[PDB]
Structures are given as C-alpha cells and as structure tokens.
Amino acid sequence: LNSQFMQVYETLKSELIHDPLFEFDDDSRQWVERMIDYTVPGGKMVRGYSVVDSYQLLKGEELTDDEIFLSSALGWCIEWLQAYFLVLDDIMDESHTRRGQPCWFRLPKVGMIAANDGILLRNHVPRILKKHFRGKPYYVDLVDLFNEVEFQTASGQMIDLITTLVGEKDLSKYSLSIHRRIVQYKTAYYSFYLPVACALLMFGEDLDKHVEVKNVLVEMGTYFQVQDDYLDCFGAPEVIGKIGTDIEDFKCSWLVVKALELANEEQKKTLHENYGKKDPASVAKVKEVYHTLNLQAVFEDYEATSYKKLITSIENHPSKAVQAVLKSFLGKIYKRQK
C-alpha cells in the first residue's frame, strides 16, 4: 500500500493549495506547494505508514478504498506535524542540512520566512482533518488528539531546550529523570502513541478505554530513543549512515547520564572536562570512560530488560487485534542496528 500512500499525499497537497478558506494567486500557490514538497514528503514516513499498518491489523482483512484513503490521510497529518517541528528545530539549532538538502531556512530566498512556513504546515493538519473527517462521529476526538500531542511535543522540546541551552553547560544539570521526561514528551507521544490512536479512533474505538495501549507505546518510544542514543556513539557509521556527534554537541544522551550514575570521581571529572568539546581527543576520553564503565553491556542489559516488560505487557492485553498492532511496533525496532 505504498504507491497509494504517496498518491494520498498528492491529493492532500493539491487540496491544500486550492483551499477555499484562503485566496491564493499564482505566486502564493507556488510558494506553498514548493514549501510542502520540500519539507513534508522527504523522509522514511514510518510514522505515517504506521497508521495504515495498525489500522489493517485492527480490521484483520483487506481495506476498502476509503479506509486506505482515510488511514493514509491521518498518517500524513502526523508527517505534516513532524515536518513543522523539524522546520523549527532546524532554525533553533542553526542546522545546515536535513534529508540530504539544505534546511528550509538556509535557502537564500527563504531565511526566517521558514518560521511562518512551519506554522502554515501545522495549520494544514486541521485543514486535512476538517476536509475528510468532519462528518465522522470521532471528529472531535481527532481534533483534540492532535492538539494534545502537539502540546506535549512542544513541551518536550521546551524542556530539552532549557535543560541543554539555558545558562552554563554544567553536566550536573543532566540526569536520568530529565532524559526520560524529554524523550517521553518530545518524541514518544507523536512517534508511537499518535499513529495507533489515529487507527483506534477510525476503527470506532474510545481512547478513554485504551490507556493501556498508550502506556505501552510511551514506554516503547522511550526505549526507542535510548537505542538511538546508544547507536549515535556505538553504531557502525557504515550501517547507521552518519557519524554521531552527541558528545561534541553536549547532548543529554542516555549514555552520559548513565555514565554519570556509574562513574567514580575521576571519571566524573573527565566527563565534566571533556563532554561537549568539538575536540577529537576530548571525545576519545569520553568514549574511553564509556568503555571502562562497560556501557555497551549496560545497554544490552537495558534492552533485554525492556523487551521482556513490553512483551509481558502486550501479552496481558485482552484484545488480540491490539497485540498484533503492538507486537508489530515492537518488532520494527527491537535490536535494530539503525
């Protein structure tokens, strides 16, 4: 159902740039169409896809043309929402590239106009919801759902920024609790809960009755980001497709907060003196501390322990349909190498 998913993108984009709520001309229609094409469909679309996959698993049989369109539409709302956050994040972080191209705000003719473009993208989400879902009994739930997850994501970004940018760098500002809070609100609600929540609402379910599903997905999304933190330092560049810079970038990574928790006082001193320095020798001393502390084994331990909990929680769920949704998510990330 890939070609169709992409076809749904083309239809939604075409609808957006002929939106009756706004008086377009040639230049403004061109501006938005190009902005959408640049910022929205350039990724792997895993979150988007997941709506269609999860919905298929809920039904148990093949989808109608309408179910494929509707599930893909919600998938795209998620991708639109992510694109908006990423456009702004690139601005705040002074990034240079994303998805193999200059960041939107880096183009000569875009500049800080990118900030309002990101805002436009966010507003595209209710336009899509209104066009195709306004007659559904669960319309209000979808609208509330997207606002709430957007709120949680913004709040997660907020604590990430103030933890890692406000004031002096001070590695003691970092901790496991803060790391969890950041990862949970910033990524886990929109990446893992949102897709399944979309599928559930479309299936006719009541989210008030699926808190269990939400809690598992949040846990899973937390595990997912720990894996990412780990891979940034220990994954092979030939496999993960980048050279990690979390150490240089003074990131609140699971690795540094774990190391801080395990270190003695010379190691803690080494960390404080070398973490966040763009220097290859300082980076090496950090990685050396991680090796000495055996962080690989600690992570393998965490991963083994997290997997069993998730599996246990999933199997304990009364719905077999839900289990198949959850196990599919757990399966796409467990022991991944990128």
Place this chain on the structure above:
Amino acid sequence: LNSQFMQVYETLKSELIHDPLFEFDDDSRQWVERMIDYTVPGGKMVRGYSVVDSYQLLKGEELTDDEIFLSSALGWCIEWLQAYFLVLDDIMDESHTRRGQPCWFRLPKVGMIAANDGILLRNHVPRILKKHFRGKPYYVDLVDLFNEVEFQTASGQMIDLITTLVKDLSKYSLSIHRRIVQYKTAYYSFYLPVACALLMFGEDLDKHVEVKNVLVEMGTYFQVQDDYLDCFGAPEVIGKIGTDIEDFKCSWLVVKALELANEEQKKTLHENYGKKDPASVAKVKEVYHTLNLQAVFEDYEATSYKKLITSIENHPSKAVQAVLKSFLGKIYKRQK
C-alpha cells in the same frame, strides 16, 4: 469588567502551569510562567476585551459571573493567539523591542528558544478552550473557529512575507494589499472576537456570513487607516515614527500612488521606496503630496464609513447592530 478580565488571566495562567497533560517541575514551571507574563498580557488587550463587550451587547443585560469568566477566557484565547504570532513576527523581522521591552527572543537567556515558546503559546489556546468549553454544545465550533482563523492569519503573514521579501515595486498592487490585510489581520482582529461572542450566545456561525463580511470589511478599512497614519499621522499622537517607506511595505499609500502616478512620478517611487536615506524617504512623501493622497484617503474613509454604517443598519438583529456599531465607533476617524 476590566479588573475581572485581569483576574481571568491569572486563573488561566495558573491552570496552564499545572496542566496534567505535561510533567512540570520547578524549572519548567518557572520558565513557562515567566514566558507567559512576558509575552501575553503587556498590551492594550482591545481584541480580548471586545469579546466581553460584544457578548454584553448581544445580551442587552448585565452579565453573570460565569458569562464574565467565559467571555474573558475567549478574549484571552485571542490575546494568546496574537501573542504567539507577534513573538514569531519579532524573530522574523529581527525586531529589538515591543510593548516597551526587548522582544522575547532578544533576552540573552532566551534567544531562538523564543520560537518554541511561541509554539507553546499557540498550544495554550486549545488547552484553555478544552478546560472551560469542552462540555458546551458549541465546543467543536470554537476549536474549528480558532484553527481556521489561525490558518488565515498565517496565510496572510505568508503573502506579506513573500510579497515584500522575495524586489521591484511593480509586483505591488491593490488586490495584493487587500489580501494581505484581510487575511493577516482582519479575521483575527475583527471577526474572531465577535464570532466568539456569537457562539457563546448560542448562534450558528453558518447563519452569520453577513456579520463576517462586514467585520472583514471593517478590518480592511482599519488597516488602510493604519497605512495612512504611518506616513501622515502625527507622531505626537501615534507614539511612533512610521518607517513603512523605508521598510519597503506594500502600504495602501504606495499602491495608490502607483495607480495615479505618471512616468516621472513612478520612476521617482521606483527609485526611492525602500531606502533608509531620509532624502529618499522625503522624495516619496513629496510624490504622495503631489498626488494628494490625503484627499484620496479622506474620500476612501468617508465612502467606507457610509458603506459600513449602511450594511450595519440593514442587519436583521438590533443586538448585532449594537455589536457592530461599537466596533465602528472604536475606529472611525481614529488618530492612532
């Protein structure tokens, strides 16, 4: 009701920093509370308060404490929404001060974090709506209303940005100016507050396209007045020195000048519009004076007022006429 209005702000801000949807701690609660106080309540609050006034005028009687709270809360949603756009506008335009203080993004401990704070402010609007209106039969209409007007406003800002920033004056035109002021300002400044009051009053907005058209027209007129005052208004009254000519703004003045200018006049405008040089700024104003744009604005004002007064007095509802006449009287022949 002014004192109750500010009390509502305190209640709303308190709810927002104890929101069970987010896991606040002391640091993040202090961050958000300070950010709200800095960015939201520092203005004149005309738009926010106009929801309370409008609802009052619809009712034709004293308000209950609940009506005072609900209409203020909607008023504050509008001020929160505006505050979010202004935080972002300051960043994009690289401004230095606003409301008598450095722009939020200019503070050394804030910087570009201001961008995500603006986003947080936007997300506070549905938090407020849901907390206080979830059980109202017009809840979905409120949420849709705010989403729609946010969309229009961001689209208006979009054409404002691309018209001015991406260079010749020939691209400027009367219809582009209309589109900019309509979408960027008129819907959130004039329609939105009345739409809020109407929904609270039990009305169906599908039945009020006429109210919408009038308010959008009134908002367009408001912006033209604003463009006029930027160049011809008294700084001693306006409280600033206009720089629209320097800023290369698609002002109503410049597009009217272009509509009327000869080849000599047009070449001068093309030569000097958008120059910081006070010599070039004064060259533009002289053209404006030669074409008698004062009398042209005077004619547009008198014509606009008569049309608006006419549409208002045709309205089937005398309570709605009171709402509309109050907005008109708030802006007619204003000097700032």
